[PDB]
Amino acid sequence: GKYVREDYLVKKVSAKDIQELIKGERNVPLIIDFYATWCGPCILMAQELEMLAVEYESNALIVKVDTDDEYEFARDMQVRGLPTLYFISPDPNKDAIRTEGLIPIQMMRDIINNDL
Amino acid sequence: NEGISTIPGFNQIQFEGFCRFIDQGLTEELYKFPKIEDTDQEIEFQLFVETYQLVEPLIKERDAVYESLTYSSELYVSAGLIWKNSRDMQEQTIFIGNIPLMNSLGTSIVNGIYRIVINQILQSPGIYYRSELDHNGISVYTGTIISDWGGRSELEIDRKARIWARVSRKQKISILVLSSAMGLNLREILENVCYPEIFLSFLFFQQRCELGRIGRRNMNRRLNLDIPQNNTFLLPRDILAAADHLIGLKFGMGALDDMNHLKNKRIRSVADLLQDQFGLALVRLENVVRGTICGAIRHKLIPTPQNLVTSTPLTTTYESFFGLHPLSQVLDRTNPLTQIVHGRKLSYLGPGGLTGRTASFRIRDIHPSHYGRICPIDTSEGINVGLIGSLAIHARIGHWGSLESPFYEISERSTGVRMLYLSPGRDEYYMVAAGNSLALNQDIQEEQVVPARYRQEFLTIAWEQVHLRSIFPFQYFSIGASLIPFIEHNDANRALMSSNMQRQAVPLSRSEKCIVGTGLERQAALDSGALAIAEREGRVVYTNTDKILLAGNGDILSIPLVIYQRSNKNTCMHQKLQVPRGKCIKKGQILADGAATVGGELALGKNVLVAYMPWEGYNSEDAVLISERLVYEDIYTSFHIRKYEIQTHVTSQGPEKVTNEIPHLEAHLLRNLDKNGIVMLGSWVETGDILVGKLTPQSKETCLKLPIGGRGRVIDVRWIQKRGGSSYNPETIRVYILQKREIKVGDKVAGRHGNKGIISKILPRQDMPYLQDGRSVDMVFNPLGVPSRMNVGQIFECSLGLAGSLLDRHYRIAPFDERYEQEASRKLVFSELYEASKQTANPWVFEPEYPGKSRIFDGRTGNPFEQPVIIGKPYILKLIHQVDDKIHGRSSGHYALVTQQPLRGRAKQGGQRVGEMEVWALEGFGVAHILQEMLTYKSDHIRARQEVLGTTIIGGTIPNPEDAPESFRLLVRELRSLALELNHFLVSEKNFQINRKE
Amino acid sequence: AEHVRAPSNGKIKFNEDLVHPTRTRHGHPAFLCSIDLYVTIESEDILHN
């Protein structure tokens, strides 16, 4: 990846990876995105998540989880529908914010800046 | 994996061809090189093929184009030379030569020139089974086998069995004799072949058998054979089978083969040409190695491997290929569209292909196989009509050399959906329906009927029986045709004209997008290569005209912009920043906008108000009357840059010297020159000035002057010292002038719908007809062209454009919108116009009595016109052909050395030619003196011509020339060189005396 | 090959004994005519021959 840059900056992690990230210690905010190739709205959400990852190069961690590969994990996370975003704060005492449906990028920025 | 869910890259063909070449063709060619052993001791040198490694170019593309150098890569392969006396093999790496590299756009840089490799369509090797009916008797059946080299092992059958090969020039040849020579014992032959009764009743070599892998496959297909793909040789079983099929054709059990089918043709890409060039270069290298070994033996020295190999063969071979091959042409960079459309051309004519004259009529027509794979409306107009064509948007080149197209599979399955690039021969055995499914007649939907394609035919069948469906809208067209909005409402004949005229557009000083479009301009501008696309994500920390700084992941990347450069066709290239400072850009987004591109979409013209009415004759035939607003507002202003260069060639007697102080020249000139003999930057120049002044000692004055029509600012001058030619080379001084050209009478304008015209008058805005709004129309067009050339989509475009301009909308419409309903274009156009009329309360935009037509007034008198006229805002382009370029005039200046006739060409200041078809008209009119004057003293008669100027200056009458012209005298001299005499020998009627005229 | 078309909507009345049955080139059944016949298109207000 030295000569050619990667086109996509968001990585598809598994459920064990998310469990280890939440269990461990974090110094940057965490954003979890549940998606499925089939949902139409998700095609847009992915573009906004790409823009947000570009805007936040190393000040925040953005990962995506496929509901088709991990359905039980997504069900245990109380995920009603596909355009769902989980905002994990760095300090582990604060409460996570869950957003559902298409939301503007400015809303995501404000949530990451203030709520997390 | 790609191109099945979106429009593929226009330059992906050259990309994948060059990739496959570098991947496998180099190794395949290096494998077949022979072991050099030419001696009694048999000193043998070898090249380790496994140790093949290319090296990055030493210079960049921006330096290669500037210094007129080639952009190539270094081939280093480890070699081992086993000396005779040393009894050991020393291993070193040698530099064989340079291999040119291809850009991401598909172009290559050789000697500082952008060149593209056009593909070629050649018949695939195989067995063909044609038939020919005799004048009297049964029809003759023949089978031809085609080899890679081009061998023709024909087989024929007469009224009898008579299985006779046509290889020999003689009457015939025995197939049984050929089989026996092949190895058949005359028993297994009859045992294996079918219908042995017919065979028994009847009572160079390497190139013909050099069947390709493709050849093997095809042979297997037509003649069912189980021969493994690997054995690519003409086996006798194949011949036996061929004979069997041939005899079977006589009894009706057969099918003749169509040689215009794509499945029977192969496509040669840049990889195929580069592989053959590399093979020829390797042959030259082996010859040079043998020669240098022979020389080293003569000089009694065992040299290192490096001493043997020279970098000359590879470099000279690739240079000669890029310079002189008929399939290597300079890239057309008149506009961004030309750069992309040039690389999609497929050509029948070429090395090993049908010449213009050779090509039969059949070759030049569409074959049902061309659907979705080749463009049916893009050809080359002229003697090569139907021989040069483009490539479909969604096509790809297959593993077997066949163009493949994407077909959806509606058949029920596990996935239930597929996008397969079916090859030409495979799609024939499928029911391909291009119609929609929006029909119910109180029965199951699968019981509905739809037109479809099967076995190269058209028929109507139920939806249960259709296997495939063509969903992609731009599947059957090319980039040129797809940029035509409302192409369904235009005739197919005018589509070619519009595609050809879109290529001529000139990039303007300012760019504006089109209100009505097809939606392909985005990818066209993306793949054109005149756009700045980021290769890394990050933020734009610094913005400047010359460079753009992009900071990402702790690294800063600098992108250099283009500021008023020059193309190959004298068109300016410039780039402007689109993104502001402090915004994030992904890997792929647009950083800057090049010429003829705004907002990331191709923009080759402007949007101007247009009315379709006759105006005082100024619109007769095709001619346009335009207003002065286009002139004084710089709507169609363009910049053109022309280069002039003279090399300082050093003669053996004396070298050229560049001095500013040159006598025998007036003081009005030479003002622009600097201390050195070159013009200064920012200097306005005109015709007859001196750009570079040279003493030229060998003294004289071989300078550079400006020709007629050259009046522009001197933007930049380059002193180019030439090196790398094995010796001191002449310096090159290149000057560049920029001529700002405005719209003028005599310029050609055009529309995307095939409408073309020449400006005839520039009326003021006050005289122009004005609408009920009060605005004068920018152009007026002739309304009689619509029934003549059958262009109805223009009306639609105009109207939609008016609507958009009022409502501030841009419409990107895919072609064939009538698949949804009937009169979909009409409904859309009328709906948008009504909305415009309601929202901006201009009632005139939609007239309920006559939708799309309004009643305008006359600017001169102020009285309304009787009938309503069409008012719209189409997209008008300005074409490259311009009056200034076409103006020419000669009085008496220069003559050819041998013919002594006036010179040819506009740049050379030559006159016009009086051909045979004009001498015939002059003789029919009866003007003998005019013909005589044109044939003698205006053309060739040196003395008469010399006397003409004197007689005209003095004013005396010009006498009739009596001597023969120089052309006749030449003939006499030539014929007498051919030992043939010619004498005039006129005889006087008065005294009966013969007088010779010399 | 001129094609005769009905001038108006109505019933067709003619004597079938004069015409001979035949099969058209389009696979359809028809009556061959070899002698001058008069057919009447019986409409609401007028008769056509």
Next chain:
Amino acid sequence: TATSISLGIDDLLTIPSKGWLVQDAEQQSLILEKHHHYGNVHAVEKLRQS
């Protein structure tokens, strides 16, 4: 110039009987295709008729 003749979209007037004619033609074509599938007519008759 005074009258300023022009051509528009709604100005291309089709005969008022194109729909009926095309409809009866395609109806006869569908009937003939159905009977060809049954076997009452062969291919050349269908081609000639269409």
Next chain:
Amino acid sequence: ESEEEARRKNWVDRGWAPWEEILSPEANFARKSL
């Protein structure tokens, strides 16, 4: 060969048989008229 021998060979080897064809009126008219 002869039609009788060919028909016998068909019946013996290929399983030919003059099965009754229950035609429609239009099909019978087509078979008789052509």
Next chain:
RNA sequence: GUAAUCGCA
């Protein structure tokens, strides 16, 4: 001065 290639109408 000749070729190659494209365009033009």
Next chain:
DNA sequence: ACAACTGCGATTAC
């Protein structure tokens, strides 16, 4: 063996 539209203009390569 012979011939198969008329001319014009642009480029690069010798």
Next chain:
DNA sequence: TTGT
């Protein structure tokens, strides 16, 4: 090639 196409035909002469």
